[PDB]
C-alpha cells in the first residue's frame, strides 16, 4: 500500500551482478575520469566506438548507405560529441535521446598567465563553472589543455599526471598568521593570481633581466613544446587536481575522483548507447559542454544538434518537424546525495541517497520551480513501468529543502521542441569539489536504467 | 489638448452596455475561474469552441478543406492551447495574434508528499510561481490535478470544491506563542512540509505499523481512485484555494477569485476570438503556461506555435518567414492596479486604476527597462486610433515607481520573429494572492479592446 | 502502573458511537458556527431550548411555579445568556455550572467607517480580540452585526453569507512590489483603514460632489435598510470570514471554521445542558462575551449572573452566600493542540493532542502561573473518578513550554466566590485564525465529559 | 445621506449663547482649576452646592425626609465626592449617573523628602499618574497638600500661588554641557531627587551641624506650621505648576491650565448636575480619584458608591439589585484633540477636533479594544436622539490610529453592574502636561450635553 525505497545491493549479489560492475564499471568509468579530465572526453570516447560510427566527413549518402543498423558520430570542434544509431522505424517517427554535459568546474590560466612576483613566478587563473568553495588550494594540481601556435600547430599539454611529472598548486597563509583571515567564509580566498609554477632556478644563462625566474621558466617551457610568452593568448587554460580516481571506502563500494559531475552519467550513457544492438526506433546520444557555465552557444545550446539530425535525416528532406517533437529524452546530470554531515540542508524524504539506484527529478529550479523543465506525469509513469520490467532501482529526489539551493539543468533546452524529457543521473557526494564520490551500485543501476530505455 | 482618463462606467450605462456585462462577463468569467483552477482551462475551453474548430488529429488537407472561414485548434499535451481562424487574405500576409498564459501561482505536492509526523499525517508541498507572500496559510484549500497509474490510467482528483467535500490547509502557530516568530516578515513562514490531510482515524483495521494515521489515509485514498503510496511520483500536485469566485463590493462592481492573474485575459481574449466572425486577415489565439515560472520550454517558449503555424500553413510550403514577421500581437497579462492602502509604492500618474479601461504597457522591466519587450510607437499609435473608432476605454501604466518592483512578460518571446507586440491586460488588486480582485467594467472594456482588434 | 492517554477513536467505533457524532455533532456544531458568527449565538440558541425555559420576563413566582424540574433562561441585552435547571436538592446546597464565552476575535467598522480614498471607497476597521497575526487580508469577508436608527429601529445586516451575496476583504501589496515590506513579521500589516466596499459605479445620478464613489454606496446602502452616513455611530461593526464551516481532512475527522474558539465549548456545553433530564442538584449554563478582550464589565465580569442566581433563588431570600460557595464549575475554553509544523514551541508531554479527548488545565498563566486560576487536586481527582465511570477520554495540557506564551481564562472570575473550578475545553489548531480546526472525536468526547458532570 | 460636524461656534453667536459661556464657563471653570489643583476640589465644590445637599452625617430618615426634590452629598475621606438628587419615580426604577475623576498627574514629595546635597537643600519627589514626559523641569512649581501632626492636627500647605509667595522647580543641565545627555528622549530626565527648596541662607543661628542649609529650612518650615523633619512621613506630597489658568489664543477661544484632564469634565458635570431642577428619575454625580494611577481601591473602585446608594436607598431595604442595573451613566474623561503639529499619530477621521462639540467614545482600549468598556449601539442611538432635540454639538473619536496609544477609562468599572455606559468628555491639547488646552465652545457644549441628559 505504502511505498518503500529498495537498496541497490542485496538485490544484486547473484555473484554475477556484483562482479559485473564491482569491477565492471568501476574500471571502465573508474579509469575514464583519469585519462580524461578536460573535455577531451571526445577524443578518448571517439577513439572508442571504433566498432562502427563515422559520419563526420564520410557523407556520401551511400558511403555507408544510411539505413537500418547504421551508426555514426558527429564531432563539434572537438568540444562536443553526438552519436546516432538507426533503427527499423523511420526518423519521422521519433527518437530516443540520452544527453549529458562533459565539462566540469575547474581553474584555468588567463590570456597572460605567466608573471613573476617576488622572486618565484606564478600563473594567473580564473575559475570556471562556479567551484564557489575556493577550497581548491593546498591539494596538488595538474595542467591539461592545449596551446595553439600562430601558424596553427596544436600542441598538447598534460603535466602532473604521471608519477614522474612535477605538480602544481595554490598556496594559502599558514594558520599561524591566518588570524586576520576570518571575515566571511563566503570568501576570504578568491583572487585569480595564484599558483606558482617555479621557484629559484633563476634564471636562463643568468643573463640579467629583472624577471629572471620568469625568463627561465619561459625558456624551460620553450624547450618542450615551442611556445613563446604569447601563444598563451591562443591557448587552452586547464588546471585540474592530479591523481587517478580511486576506490573509496573500506568496502570499495564508492569511487572518489574529479569530474564525477555528469561525466559519470556521460559515461554510463555512453556504454549503454554503445552496446545497444537491434534498434526499433533510432536513438541518439548527446555530449556537450558549457553546462556548468550557463550552456551558452557555440558548444552547448548551439544548433549543432538541430542542424545535424537534419544533415543526418538527409541520408526525406523538408522540415516536417515532427521528428523531434515525437522524441523522448533522458537528459541526465548528477544530483546531491544526502550527506550525514549536513542533514538540515535537505528534506530527508524526497532526497537522493547513496546507493538507492538511479535518480529522477520531475522539477529542479529555485524560488518556486523557477526556470527549469517539469517532466510530464504520463511520461514519468511510462519510465516507471519500463524501469520495472527490466528491473533497475530508481529513486526520486529534490535539491535541498525547498528554498535552499538553486537549480537549472539543460533539460528544458531540448524540450523546447516538444520532447518528453526528465532529469536523471547518479547521486554524488560533495559536488563541484576537486574530489567527488559516487556509489558503484548507483553507477551500474543508472547504466541499466539507460539501456532499459532502448525498447518501448 | 490635455488628455484625461475617464471611468469606464458612466460612459456605459445605456441600460444595455451594463447588463451586457454586469451579468455579461461576470458570469462567464465569473464562473470560468471556478470550475477551472488548474491549467485544465484547456479542457473546459476546448469543450467550448465546439462551434467549429478541430484540427488536432483531423488533418486531411480537405478533411475540413483549410480555406476561408475555417477554424481549428491545437492541443499541446493538454497543458496548452492555440486557436486559428482563417481569413480572406493569405497567411503569408500576416496574423492577428492574442496571447496569454493560463497557469497561476499555487502550492503543489512533492514526489513523496504523504508522510506522518506526530500522530496526524501531512502532505509535503513546494510552492510554484512565486507566491512569495506565504500568507497562504489559515484559509481553506482544495486539491486538484491528476494522478497517473503505472499502467497509464489517468485519474482525476478534485477535492474541496463541492459544498460537501472536505477541505485542506496549512497551519500556523497561534499568536499566543508566535512571539519568537518576529524576525523578517520577508519570511518566517516558508517550509515545504505543511498541510495535514488527516488526523486521528488511526488507522486501517488497527493492524499496528507505527505510521498508523498515514497507513489509514493511504487506504482511504486507495478505495477512491486506485493509487498506492507510489504513483504520487507520477502525479500532478495541485493545491488551490477552495470556493467559487464571488461578487466583490456593495455595488457588485468587482470580482474576487483565484487565478484572476492573466486567466482573466486568457478568457476575454477567448470570447473575443470565439465570437469573431468574418475575418479579413487570419487571426489566432495562444494560451500557454509556465509563464509564472519563467516560461521555459515544453509548454511555454516551445516551438508548439512555431511548428504549428507551419503545420497549419501546409493546408504554400517553404519557410517564406514573412508570415510571422508581418503579424501583430497583443500579448496580454494583468497589471498592478493602484491600491489606496499602499500608495507610496507607485507613481500615481503612469499607474493603472481600477475601472479606467484596458491597460497598455510600452515597457515592463527592472533596473532601466532591463529584460522586456518595448512596443514601437508607430504600432501604439495604430492601436490608439483603433481603440478610438470602436471606442473602448484604455489607460497606460508602469509597474511601480521606477526602481521598485521587477517585471518580465512573455511579450518579447514572440517579438523575436519581428512582430509588433505590446503589453495589454486588466488591472488587478493584490496579484498572486489566493484571492485577487478585478473590475467588471475593465473585464468588459478589455474584451471589446481585443475584439476591436479584428479588422481596422 | 504507568500511564498513556490513548486515542478517542478505536474506543469509539461501536458503529453507533461513531455515527452518533461523525454526523452527530458534526452537523449540529458544524452548522452552528455557520449561521451564527457574531455573538448572536444568543438568538439562535435562545430559539432552541424552546423545549422549556423562559424566565426572562415571565416572573410570577407561580408563573411557572419555580420548583423541581423547572428550566429557565435569562437574556443579557442579547449579548449574554444563562440557563438554569432546578433539581431535587435546594439551591442553598450548591450548583453545577458550565461556563463559556461566545465572542471571538474579528474586525469591526469604526464609528465613521465609510470614507473614499482615490476613487474607490473603503471602510475603516479596528480589530478586536487580538488577532495579532493580521494575516486576515486576502481571504473573503462577510459583514454581520446590527445598525440602530436614531428612532431606535434595529436593522439586521448579514452580507456575504449567501452564495449570491457579494463579499468583502482587505487588500495587500503584490509580491512584485512588496520588497520594501520586510521589516519585522511582527507587524508590517496593521492599519485600521482597510477593506474597500465599492469600486467605480461612481456615483449616484452622477450629480457631482467630489466623493462620488462614496456618495453612491451610501445611497445604495440607503435603499436597503434605511440608514444615513450617521447611524454608523450607533451601529454594530462586524467583519468575519465568509463561508460555512466544512469537513476538514480526507477522512472527515476534523472541522474547519471560524469562531471555533470556545464557541465549540459553548455549544457542546449547550447540548449537554439541554438534553439533561432528572437533575439531582440544580445546574446552570453561562455564556458571556468580552472574554477575548479582557472580560470587562457590562457583559462578562458583570453581576448579571450574581444578581440573577438570586433573582432566581427568590422563586429563600437573604444572602446566605453558601449557595455559590458550594458549587462546582467547569469553565471551559479551547486550548492549543500540538502542531506538527511548530513543535519547538511546546513541551510535547503536557500538551494537548488532536483527538485525545477533553482537555484539562490545572493552571494557565504566564511568568510563573501568574494571573490565573489554579484548580484544587481534591476537585481534580473527583473529576477523574467521574470521567472514568461514564468513561470519556481526557488529557491534561499546558500552554507552551513554560516561559513561552501567556494565558488567562475567565475561570478565576467565578472562583472568587469559593467554587471548585477547573479549565476544560477542546484542543484547536491555529487559534484566533479566520479558520480554526477541531477533532470531531474531541468535540464528542468533550460533550460527554460535560454531560457526565450531571451527577455522581 | 451623508454628514458633517462643523465648529460649535457660528451656531452659537446668538449674542447670548456666546456671552453665556465666553465669560460664562470661562470664569467658573476658568477659576476652578486655579483655586483647586490638588483633589481638594471636594472642599471648594462641597462649599458650593450650599444650595441644599448634606446627608454626610445628617442621617435621620426624616432629618431631611428623604423624598421628592431632595438633594444630598457624601464625602469620602475628603478625597471623593458623590451627589444625589431624588426624582418622582422610585430609586428601584434606575439612575442617571455622571462620573469623572478629580485627580491629575503631578509630582509629590517622598516620605523623607528633605535632604541637603552640596550646600543647597533639595526635596525628594516621585511623580504620580504617569506624566511620562518628564518635561516638568524648568517651569515654576507650587506646593499644595496637607501635613498631619502626630497628634492629628491637619495643617494646610499652599506655597507659590499668591503673587508674593516664593516658587519652586526642578533644574536641568544647561545646553552648554548637556551634550552627554542625548541617548533616548524616552528618558534622560527621570530621577526622583530633584527640586531644591533653599540655597545659602545657611543656617539657623549658624550653630554648626554639617547639614546647615537643611537645618535652616527645617527651622523656617517650623516657624510656619509646626512640623518637624518627621511628620513628612504622615504628610501629603503635592507639587504642581504655579499660576492661574488663562485665556489661550488671540481670540480668547481656548483655556490653558493645569488639571484640565477630566477636572474640566468633573466641573461641567457639576454645574449641569447642580442647576438641575425638577427630576423625573433620581440622578447622581460621582467624583473619585486614583484614576490616573489605576483606579485602585479606597477612593476609586471602592464600594463608597455601592454601599452608599444603598445607605441612601434606605431613606425599601433588601438588595433588589435592579436599582443599578437599570441605570444610565455618562462616565466622562478628556480625549486627545487632533494636533496640527503631530498629525501622523491620528487617523484624521475618527479623531476629536478642537471645537466640534462633546466627544463620544464607543470603545477605548489597546491592541484590539483590549481592556475597556464598549458602549451598546441601542444606548448610543438614544443619546444621539437626545443630544439632537436639546441640540448640542457632538463628535465621535478614537485615541490614535489603531495600534498607537493605549487606553482605559473607569467606564467599565460601573458597567459591571449592567448599566448603560459610554465615554464622554471634552477634547484637550497636550494631555498630562503641566499646561493643557481646551475649547470654551467645547466646555460649554459638553455641559449642555450633560444637562440634556436630565430628562429621558
Ligand atoms: Mn552537471
Ligand atoms: Mn552541475
Ligand atoms: Mn504574474
Ligand atoms: Mn501574469
Ligand atoms: Mn482566546
Ligand atoms: Mn478562548
Ligand atoms: Mn488620564
Ligand atoms: Mn483622565
- Cβ pair C199:B341 closer than 8 A: no
Spatial separation of the C-alpha atoms in residues C281 and C279, rounded to whole Å: 6
Closest by Cβ to C228, choosing from D1, D376, D416 = D1
CA Rg value for chain C: 24
The three cell numbers of residue B17 are 452596455
What is the DSSP-derived secondary structure letter of residue A408? Answer: -
d(CA A314, CA A91) in angstroms, rounded, equals 10
Rounded to the nearest 5 degrees, what angle is found at the Cα of C137, between the Cα atoms of C133 and C140? Answer: 125
Instruction: State the sign of the Cα–Cα–Cα–Cα dihedral C337, C339, C344, C348.
Output: positive
CA angle B433, B436, B439 (to 5 degrees): 160
Nearest CB partner across the interface for D402, out of C152, C190, C218: C190
Domains, chain C, in order of start with CATH, read 1-105+244-456 (3.40.630.10), 106-243 (2.30.250.10)
Do B167 and C139 make contact, defined as CB atoms within 8 angstroms? no
What's the full length of chain B, in residues?
A: 456
Asked whether the beta carbons of D360 and D394 are under 8 A apart, the reply is yes
Q: D395: distance to nearest CA of chain C, Å?
A: 10
| C-alpha torsion sign, points B44, B45, B50, B53 | negative
Q: How many CB atoms lie within 10 A of CB A357?
A: 27
Cell triple for A212: 629572471
> Which residue has 479582557 as its cell numbers?
C294
Question: Dihedral angle at the C-alpha atoms of A136, A139, A140, A144, nearest 10 degrees?
Answer: -20
On chain A, the residues whose CB falls within 8 A of the CB of B236 are 377
Put simply, the answer to whether C250 touches B118 (Cβ < 8 Å) is no
What DSSP element (H or E) covers D29? helix D25-35
Yes or no: say if A141 and A167 are a contact pair by the CB < 8 Å rule. Answer: yes
Identify which of B385, D336, D67, A272 has the alpha carbon closest to the alpha carbon of residue A264: A272
| C332 vs C344: CA distance, rounded Å | 26
Q: Is D101 annotated as a binding residue?
A: yes
Distance between CA atoms of A25 and A449, rounded to whole angstroms? Answer: 14
Could you please report the per-residue DSSP string of C29-87? HHHHHHH--SSTHHHHHHHS--SS---TT---STTTT--TT---EEEETTTEEEEEE--
Q: Nearest by CB to B251, which of C117, C220, C244?
A: C220
DSSP strand E in C3-161: where?
73-76, 80-85, 96-101, 114-116, 121-123, 141-143, 146-148, 154-156
Shortest CA distance from A370: residue in chain B: B293
State the count of interchain CB pairs (< 8 A) between A and B: 147
Rounded to whole angstroms, the Cα distance separating A186 from A175 reads 18
Burial class (CB in 10 A: 0-12, 13-18, 19+), B151: exposed
Per DSSP, what are the bridge partners of residue A143? A159, A239
Please indicate whether chains D and C are in contact, defined as at least 3 beta carbon pairs under 8 Å.
yes
Question: Could you tell me if D272 and D44 are in contact, meaning their C-beta atoms sit under 8 angstroms apart?
Answer: no
User: Distance of CA D370 to CAs B213, C372, D293, D378, D412, Å?
Assistant: 41, 18, 18, 22, 12
Which cell numbers in the block locate residue D50? Answer: 450650599
Residue D290: HSE in the Cβ half-sphere, 13 Å Cα cutoff? 13
Cell of A347: 528534506
> Strand A73-76 vs strand A80-85: parallel, antiparallel, or unpaired?
antiparallel
8 Å CB contact of B140 and C354 = no
Dist. CA B17–CA A281, nearest whole Å: 59
Residues with a beta carbon under 5 angstroms from ion ligand 7: D 292
Interface test with D, best of C76, C191, C212, C297 (most D CBs within 10 A): C297
Q: At D308, give phi and psi (nearest 5°).
A: -160, -40
Rounded Cα distance, B88 and D206, in Å: 122
- Is D237 in contact with D82 (CB distance < 8 Å)? no
Q: Which residues of C touch D295 (CB under 8 A)?
A: none
Q: Is the distance from CB of C400 to CB of C345 less than 8 angstroms?
A: yes
| CA atoms of D432 and D261, how far apart (whole Å) | 7
Q: Are B227 and B155 in contact (CB under 8 A)?
A: yes
What's the half-sphere exposure (Cβ side, CA atoms, 13 Å) at A225? Answer: 23
Chain D contact set for C149 (CB, 8 A):
381
Q: In this structure, are strands B96-101 and B114-116 parallel, antiparallel, or unpaired?
A: unpaired
A to B contact (≥3 Cβ pairs closer than 8 Å): yes
Contacts of C311 in chain D (CB under 8 A): 321
Kindly state the DSSP code that residue D92 receives in the 8-state scheme. Answer: G
Residue A428 near residue A260, CB atoms below 8 Å = yes
User: Any idea how long chain A is?
Assistant: 456
Instruction: Please choose, from the candidates C200, C144, C193, the residue with its C-alpha nearest in 3D space to the C-alpha of residue C171.
Output: C193
The set of cell numbers assigned to B361 is 504597457
Chain B hits for C353, CB-CB cut-off 8 Å, are 118-119
* Environment of ion ligand 2 (residues, CB < 5 A): A 261
- How many whole angstroms separate alpha carbon C251 and alpha carbon A437? 45
Q: Inspect the interface and report whether the beta carbons of D363 and C303 lie closer than 8 Å.
A: no
D171 min Cα distance to partner chain C (Å)? 40
Shortest CA distance to B455 belongs to which of B330, B271, B276?
B276
CB C396 within 8 A of CB C360: yes
C434/B172 CB distance under 8 A: no
Which chain A residues are closer than 8 Å to B230 by Cβ? 3, 384
Q: What is the resolution of this structure in A?
A: 3.2
Report whether B198 contacts C250 (CB < 8 A): yes
Which residues on chain B are in Cβ contact (under 8 Å) with A421? Answer: 298
Residues with Cβ within 8 Å of B406's Cβ and at least 6 positions away in sequence, in order, are B365, B366, C176
Where are any strands of DSSP class E within A22-106? 73-76, 80-85, 96-101
Residue B155: strand pairing partners: B147
Task: Write out the binding residues of C for Zn(2+).
Answer: 101, 176, 432
Q: Do B148 and A380 touch (CB under 8 A)?
A: yes
Determined by X-ray
Contact C302 D418 (CB under 8 A): yes
Cα D53 from Cα B432, distance rounded (Å):
71
Is the C-alpha dihedral spanning A108, A113, A118, A119 positive or negative?
Answer: positive
Residues 6+ apart with CB under 8 A from C430: B137, B138, B171, B172, B173, B174, C339, C436, C437
- For residue D424, the SS3 value is strand
The rounded distance, in Å, linking the Cα atoms of B170 and B109 is 13
Runs of H (alpha helix) within C329-401: 377-389
Q: Do the beta carbons of residue A83 and residue A70 sit within 8 Å? A: no
Three-class SS of residue B208?
coil
> Which of A325, A378, A396 lies at the smallest CB-CB distance from B233?
A396
- Note whether B177 contacts C253, CB cutoff 8 Å: no
- The percent of chain A in helix, strand and coil, each rounded to the nearest 5, is 25, 20, 60
Amino acid at each position: 500500500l505504502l511505498k518503500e525505497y529498495k537498496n541497490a545491493w542485496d538485490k544484486y549479489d547473484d555473484k554475477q551482478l556484483k562482479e559485473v560492475f564491482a569491477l565492471g564499471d568501476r574500471f571502465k568509468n573508474f579509469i575514464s575520469n583519469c585519462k580524461t579530465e578536460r573535455e577531451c572526453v571526445t577524443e578518448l570516447i571517439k577513439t572508442a566506438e571504433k566498432s562502427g560510427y563515422r559520419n563526420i566527413e564520410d557523407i556520401l549518402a551511400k558511403g555507408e548507405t544510411l539505413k537500418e543498423g547504421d551508426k555514426v558520430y558527429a564531432n563539434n570542434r572537438g568540444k562536443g560529441l553526438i552519436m546516432f544509431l538507426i533503427g527499423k522505424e523511420p526518423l519521422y517517427t521519433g527518437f530516443k535521446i540520452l544527453g549529458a554535459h562533459i565539462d566540469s568546474p575547474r581553474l584555468d590560466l588567463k590570456q597572460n598567465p605567466l608573471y613573476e612576483d617576488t622572486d618565484l613566478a606564478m600563473l594567473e587563473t580564473h575559475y570556471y563553472g562556479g567551484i564557489k568553495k575556493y577550497q581548491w588550494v593546498t591539494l596538488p594540481l595538474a595542467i591539461h589543455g592545449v596551446i595553439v601556435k600562430k601558424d596553427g600547430t596544436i600542441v598538447n599539454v598534460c603535466v602532473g599526471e604521471d608519477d614522474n611529472d612535477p605538480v602544481f598548486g595554490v598556496s594559502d597563509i599558514l594558520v599561524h598568521l591566518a588570524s586576520e583571515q576570518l571575515e566571511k567564509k563566503a570568501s576570504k580566498v578568491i583572487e585569480g593570481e595564484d599558483l606558482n609554477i617555479l621557484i629559484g632556478s633563476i634564471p636562463l644563462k643568468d643573463g640579467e633581466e629583472k624577471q629572471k625566474v620568469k625568463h627561465n621558466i619561459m625558456k624551460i617551457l620553450n624547450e618542450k613544446y615551442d611556445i613563446s610568452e604569447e601563444d598563451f593568448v591562443s591557448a587552452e587554460l586547464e588546471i585540474v587536481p592530479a591523481g587517478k580516481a580511486r576506490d573509496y571506502g573500506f568496502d570499495r563500494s564508492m569511487v572518489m575522483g574529479y569530474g564525477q559531475d555528469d561525466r559519470i552519467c556521460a559515461y554510463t550513457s555512453f556504454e549503454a548507447m554503445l552496446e545497444m544492438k537491434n534498434a526499433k526506433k533510432t536513438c541518439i546520444t548527446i555530449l556537450v559542454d558549457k553546462e556548468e557555465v550557463g550552456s551558452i552557444g557555440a558548444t552547448g545550446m548551439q544548433s549543432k544538434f538541430f542542424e545535424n539530425t537534419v544533415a543526418d535525416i538527409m541520408s526525406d528532406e523538408l522540415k516536417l518537424r515532427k521528428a523531434l517533437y515525437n522524441s523522448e529524452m533522458l537528459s541526465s546530470d548528477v544530483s546531491a546525495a544526502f550527506d550525514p554531515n549536513y542533514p538540515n540542508v535537505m528534506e530527508k524524504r524526497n532526497s537522493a541517497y547513496l546507493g538507492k539506484g538511479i535518480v529522477f527529478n520531475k522539477y529542479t529550479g529555485s524560488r518556486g520551480k523557477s526556470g527549469c523543465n517539469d517532466a510530464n506525469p504520463e511520461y514519468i509513469a511510462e519510465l516507471r513501468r519500463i524501469l520495472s520490467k527490466e528491473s533497475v532501482n530508481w529513486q526520486t529526489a529534490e535539491l535541498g529543502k525547498v528554498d535552499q539551493g538553486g537549480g537549472g539543468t539543460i533539460a528544458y533546452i531540448l524540450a523546447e521542441y516538444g520532447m518528453q524529457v526528465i532529469d536523471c543521473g547518479v547521486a554524488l557526494l560533495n559536488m563541484h569539489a576537486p574530489w567527488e564520490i559516487s556509489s558503484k551500485a548507483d553507477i551500474y543501476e543508472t547504466k541499466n536504467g539507460y539501456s532499459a530505455f532502448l525498447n518501448n
